[PDB]
């Protein structure tokens, strides 16, 4: 099979800048290469066919070049909505094969998160488990620290984090931190605190509630 | 316009067979071939095979013995079947159509079907409210907890509410069950006039829940 | 560098 090596693995640029993707083949494949875009929960979207030919409905900032073994997908001026993964495909030799993809990330100014805390619902408590959720909304850059304290006790190992992909419009992230306790444990304590550390904040932000009120 | 729509996602047991139906419209299976591609953690995008306008099939080499593709032209349906799955066959499977009848530039894709190869049992989620309690913007959400397998779909107010929605990637709990939350920020002044509902659908369990989310 | 089934995005 033709092996397709895409590079680099991650690309990071700012809107308006130009960006190029490399796709190199293990042997010559003429101009028989196609490019695809993939967003979150999406199917691949055909961008270019035969190295350089336009696709209907595809913005003109997308172009491609190359022949032989060395191919380039280019975006002459990047838009926030171009946040995605990009793949190449060869079909000079059977079977058609794909490369492993390059990730496109966007730079932007620092944005501090808006932090919210949610106690567990009385509905969940009926099951014998408490979930405490801490939301960090619309921040940049990705790196953030969430520290959980229950009655001033540092919590460790009993929380899980989930981060969205960059927003296609403002290029921010959002993050949820979920602290999971047994109901018995949750009822033995009072003060539940989520403390957030981020480059965009001049000192950490704490959101807390007292069980009950 | 041209469309391909696949059957729902779900569970296949170790060593058992996988079946997906691709229903097309906007063109005729008598004029175009339909391809199958999957996308997996270990191998990425992988081309599996094709059924051509006139009924012929090609299968990529590592699948010639466990793969079969058939179709019904009149019903515009293509049938994918693959035998003896192991866990590294867990992937998103797509049907796809090329631009020209004989070619491989894949301009049209199905929405995909996430296939989990597992001995475990299907389990629907419980849905819990993340109740609003800051510049007149309030945040509220739904906690979609303890389901298997992936995926679950979340939307707000039957699709009418999209702005400010963040639906987080599912995370796998030590119990082997998944969890995720979906949040949204709204004007606090609308908490007394607007209703906020997360529409939750977990197809592998046919669990489908609307959760109203209110200040508590 | 690995496809993530949850998100359909590359992750490491």
Numbering used by the authors:
A (entry chain A): 1 to 213
B (entry chain B): 1 to 133, 138 to 220
C (entry chain E): 1 to 12
Please give me the paper's original passages concerning this structure.
Multiple strategies have been developed to modify monoclonal antibodies, including chemical conjugation and protein engineering. Recently, we identified a cyclic, 12-amino-acid peptide that binds in a cavity formed by all four IgG domains of the cetuximab Fab. Herein, multiple crystal structures of meditope peptide derivatives incorporating natural and unnatural amino acids bound to the cetuximab Fab domain are presented.
Changes in the structure were minimal compared with the original diglycine-linked meditope (r.m.s.d.s of 0.131 and 0.125 Å for Arg8Cit and Arg9Cit, respectively, calculated over 12 Cα atoms). Beyond a difference in charge, the substitution of the amide for the guanidinium group also reduces the number of hydrogen bonds. There is one hydrogen bond between NH2 (the amide O atom in citrulline) and O=C of Gln111 HC. Finally, it was observed that substitution of Arg8 and Arg9 by citrulline dramatically reduced the overall affinity, presumably owing to lost electrostatic interactions. Attempts to reduce the charge of the residues in positions 8 and 9 resulted in weaker affinity.
